[PDB]
Amino acid sequence: MLSTGTKSLDSLLGGGFAPGVLTQVYGPYASGKTTLALQTGLLSGKKVAYVDTEGGFSPERLVQMAETRGLNPEEALSRFILFTPSDFKEQRRVIGSLKKTVDSNFALVVVDSITAHYRAEENRSGLIAELSRQLQVLLWIARKHNIPVIVINQVHFDSRTEMTKPVAEQTLGYRCKDILRLDKLPKPGLRVAVLERHRFRPEGLMAYFRITERGIEDVE
Numbered sequence: 001m002l003s004t005g006t007k008s009l010d011s012l013l014g015g016g017f018a019p020g021v022l023t024q025v026y027g028p029y030a031s032g033k034t035t036l037a038l039q040t041g042l043l044s045g046k047k048v049a050y051v052d053t054e055g056g057f058s059p060e061r062l063v064q065m066a067e068t069r070g071l072n073p074e075e076a077l078s079r080f081i082l083f084t085p086s087d088f089k090e091q092r093r094v095i096g097s098l099k100k101t102v103d104s105n106f107a108l109v110v111v112d113s114i115t116a117h118y119r120a121e122e123n124r125s126g127l128i129a130e131l132s133r134q135l136q137v138l139l140w141i142a143r144k145h146n147i148p149v150i151v152i153n154q155v156h157f158d159s160r161t162e163m164t165k166p167v168a169e170q171t172l173g174y175r176c177k178d179i180l181r182l183d184k185l186p187k188p189g190l191r192v193a194v195l196e197r198h199r200f201r202p203e204g205l206m207a208y209f210r211i212t213e214r215g216i217e218d219v220e
Contacts, residue, residue, distance in 0.1 A: 003108065003148055004043045005036070008218045009193055012207040014200045017150070017178065020143040022135075023198075024176030026153040026166050031182040031191045032211045037110040037150055038062060039215045042071070042079050047106035049098055050080035053088055056112050056152075068214045080110075088116025088127075095134050099141060109142075109149035114167055128168050135175035151176055156183055173197070190219070 002016030010016065017023045017040075027033060034056045041048035042062065050057070059077060066076045081102060085094050095111065116127055135151070142149050153172065157165040166172055172179065179197035190210040195203050210219045 023178035027182035052112040113152035
């Protein structure tokens with residue numbers, strides 16, 4: 001197993017992201033950021049660790065999708081182990097804990113994944129650090145543990161100015177090896193994946209798609 005998905009994406013990704021490595025995903029809101037994480041998991045058979053620190057989690061969205069595609073509600077709920085937090089300084093506690101002290105023979109991991117705030121005195125940088133040690137462990141282990149994770153970052157290619165495009169770049173581009181990206185295109189419900197990094201299957205592989213109310217569908 002690599003991981004599930006669609007086909008418009010599946011072809012692209014090499015077919016299911018990839019084990020051993022973390023496939024970083026950065027883009028804006030309203031793009032399918034979360035809608036993948038879920039679909040990818042409840043259909044990979046068993047347990048996925050899902051760690052959100054903001055919105056994402058949906059015990060309604062999970063059900064609506066397991067409804068129409070055919071599956072099970074009451075049971076599905078217990079797939080993505082019930083984790084967060086919403087205390088980002090104190091997320092390490094959970095990101096370090098959930099890996100070593102939650103693991104077993106199970107599918108994935110998805111995080112949410114970016115910045116946090118204190119109040120003043122310019123924290124930013126100090127926190128722009130955070131993202132490198134969490135991922136240090138979040139890397140050596142994913143490989144050392146033949147497991148695939150999904151790191152949910154933000155902002156994407158805004159332009160080239162304001163530090164080129166990704167949040168903390170150079171780290172993501174060393175800590176995460178498979179850089180994907182979801183951006184919004186003219187259709188409320190239809191974005192586009194473009195592999196910014198990966199091994200097998202060229203970066204120039206820009207694939208398209210559509211998200212419906214049930215999950216990622218292919219188009220025409």
